[PDB]
Each structure stands twice: as C-alpha cells, then as structure tokens.
C-alpha cells in the first residue's frame, strides 16, 4: 500500500517466530523500540499488528517515537511509547519502474497534526491560503496527495524501502501470540530434570503401562504427588520415578 493508506492486518492465536526476521541478514534496519532486539521469543502477547507502507530511504529515520517531517507527522504518526519494532529493507529492484513509478503516493499538505495510529484517506482540496477553496484547484489551492515518482537511476535517498512496523499489545484478554517453545531429546532411565508444560522438577523417567484418558496431561498419586505424565510430542505415558536418595 501507500503511506496515506497503510493497511494493517492483525494476527492472533498463533505461534509466531521472530528469529527468521532478526537473524535473516536481509533487512536494512531492525531498530526495536521499547523491547530488546533479542529475547522476543519469550514474550507472549495478546494480539500484534503489522503496518505496511513504502517510503524513501531518507524517510525511514522518521519512523521512530518522536520526529518531525512530512511523513512522520502528516502521513504516519508513531505513538510516543512504542513497544513493537520497525522493520525495513531496500526494494528498489522490484518496486521501482523504468520511466517513473507513480503507484506509491503520499500526503504533503494537511490542516492539523495527526494522532497516533490514524488512517485518513480523505482527498479534499486543502486550503493553503485564507480563501475557501470549495473544491477547485488553480486558486492557490493545493491537492493533499502527491506522487513519489520512483526511478531506478536515483541516489540511495530516493529508493523504495518497504517498511513493516510490527506493533505489540498486551491487553487484559489472555495472551494468544506466544513464542516458539523448543524441546529436547527424551532422556529416560536416568536421574534428570524434566521441564514439561505445567510440571517442573526432577526424577527418573521410565516406561509406564497406565492408559490415560485422551484429554489429560499428567496424573498425581493419593497424596497429591505427580508420578506419571504424558509426553507432549508423542502420545506416550511415562512414569516419573523419584531419583534415588538416602543417608550415609
């Protein structure tokens, strides 16, 4: 999309991985405001957003909490306390067109400072002077939307840069967007420490013949002591044997 009609798309109820974006060696800028560039796979959010727009090279710096410019004020207003992360990369090879690329537009003239997270696709003739334009151009009245005109034979400052401003949000609803929880090999018949979903402790993992109902995860004994659990990956029932101890 363009800068004045940035189409966001919310994505929730998913296991999203951010390692394919940070450790990609393909993006130009990866300035993550608020949150750290790493350890983002351990922050479970409710719902995330993805703002998409194409700007020039010298306009990527304006996408930050607190800036001044024609794009950072009249086109896209980033909030002061931003917790997501801005992702941008060069796209001059496919976005630019030989002879002029007039498919990406932006708004120059407005009447007031824009608010954070606002999309105004209004196309009324803004009054530059004091006289009411009433909807005619040629009387010192200027059109708000202007063309970019991308050309491959330009400097680095006039090249298309697709920007994906990922936004985060932690609402009162239960968090759905979580992080990829990695797993390890199945260690059995040894005094080790298990790290299952709800259970955490130590013990000897052995084979079990108990057949659990196909909706449960673990099971406790008469004294509320867990002794048999089910593997998360495979539908197998294990027997947590207490690791041997004693006195000398």
């Amino acid at each position, epitope marked *: 999309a363009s800068v004045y009609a940035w189409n966001r798309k919310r994505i929730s109820n998913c296991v999203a991985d951010y390692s394919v974006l940070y450790n990609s060696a393909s993006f130009s800028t990866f300035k993550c405001y608020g949150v750290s560039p790493t350890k983002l796979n351990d922050l479970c959010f409710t719902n995330v957003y993805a703002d998409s727009f194409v700007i020039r090279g010298d306009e990527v710096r304006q996408i930050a909490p607190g800036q001044t410019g024609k794009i950072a004020d009249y086109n896209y207003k980033l909030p002061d306390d931003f917790t997501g992360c801005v992702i941008a990369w060069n796209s001059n090879n496919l976005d630019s067109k030989v002879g*002029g690329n*007039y498919n990406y*537009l932006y708004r120059l003239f407005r009447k007031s400072n824009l608010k954070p997270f606002e999309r105004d696709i209004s196309t009324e*003739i803004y009054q530059a002077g004091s006289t009411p334009c*009433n909807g005619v*151009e*040629g009387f010192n009245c200027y059109f708000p*939307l202007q063309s970019y*005109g991308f050309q491959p034979t330009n400097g680095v400052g006039y090249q298309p840069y697709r920007v994906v401003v990922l936004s985060f949000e932690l609402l009162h609803a239960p968090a759905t967007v979580c992080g990829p929880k990695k797993s390890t090999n199945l260690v059995k018949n040894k005094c080790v420490n298990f790290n299952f979903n709800g259970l955490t402790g130590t013990g000897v993992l052995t084979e079990s013949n108990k057949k659990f109902l196909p909706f449960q995860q673990f099971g406790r004994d008469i004294a509320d002591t867990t002794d048999a659990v089910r593997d998360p990956q495979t539908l197998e029932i294990l027997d947590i044997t207490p690791c041997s101890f004693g006195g000398v």
Partner: antibody
Amino acid sequence: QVQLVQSGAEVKRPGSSVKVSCKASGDTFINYAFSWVRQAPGQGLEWMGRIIPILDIAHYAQKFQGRLTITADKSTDTAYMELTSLKSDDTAVYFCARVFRGSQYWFDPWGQGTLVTVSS
Amino acid sequence: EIVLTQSPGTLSLSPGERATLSCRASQSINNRHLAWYQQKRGQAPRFLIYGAASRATGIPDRFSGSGSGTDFTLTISRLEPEDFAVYYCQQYGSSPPTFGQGTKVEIKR
C-alpha cells in the same frame, strides 16, 4: 494548456465498441486529470466520465453509468474512452479535455473530436 | 444547478455592441461558479471566463463577465469580427457538470 490531440474518425456499425485515445503533451500527466464530453449535432455537451490518473479512480454520470469504461495509460500519457453497446443515438463528437483534481473542475483545454457514427 | 436554458437565441443583428448570453437555471447557483466557452464552426472549443469575474489565460480584455446570483450575463464590449462563435455555459457549482445551448453571433444581410 497542453496540446491535446485525439485519434481519427472511427466510423463503425451498431454493435461494435471502440476506444478513443488522447495524448498528453507539455507538462506531466500524473498531475492533472482528463475527462470526456460528447457533442451531438443538435444536442448539447453532456459530461460522461472523468478519471483521476494519480488516484486511478474514475467517475460516471447518471445516464452513462455501466455502459462506459474509461481508463488511462500513465506510461505514454494517454487517456482511453471505451464505450460498449454503441447505439444509433450515440452519434456525437467526443472531445478530450484536461481538468483539475478535485470535486469541481472546468475544461480549460480541448482536444480535436472523433466521429464514431454507427451507420456502417 | 440542473439546466442552463439560454435566454437569447440569435445575436446576428449587429457586431458592434455588447451581448447578454443569459444562462438561467432553476436552482440557485453557487458562489459565482460558471465557466464560459467559445466554439466556432464546430471545432475544439476554448475557455473564456472562470468564476464569472476573472479573465482566462490568454483571453484579451475584450470580454466582461457579470452576475453574482442566478441571472448571469456575459457582456462583450466592442464586438470584433473574430467573435462570431457560439458561447456556452458550465455551472461547476453542483455535482453533475451541465452545459447550455448557446447563441450564434453572425452579421446581418
């Protein structure tokens, strides 16, 4: 304003659609919009459509809606006016004109005129 | 804002005075939103006056627009032999742009 030129007289028969072209000299084409108006012998000028090149959107009147398909060509600065179902009452001189972007506009320049009378 | 019935029908009496070109309408016009034209011998027209008050680019001061309500008039002082065309009207104050009929100005015989 700009030196607007149109195509030649495309004399056809009732039951064959055509598309008239209109070049754009002088200044750029992604800055000023074009329109189309017909002029029939004895009748007056009736506005049909006005396409915005920068916004890639077009408009239609109340008596020509659905029966016309007006497009543009931003590669060579040319406007296309394709009219389907050319009836015998469509004998009119179609003029090309450039308008200003906005709700209201006026036809400052003019083209040449195309005769597409369906009597073949 | 929907019709532009021309009051005069023929001004071929004498090309040595002014004209009227009264473009009446049923609905009240907007704040002087009227455009005049000039078409000679069935060819490409030309823009004459915008806003009914200002002169167009390249048009000499031989014309004069008047009217601010609904009875707009166009007076052409010292009519020249060149002004032998049909003057139209365009009320661009409403949503649908409509035109009028015109008046054929010629000489007397």
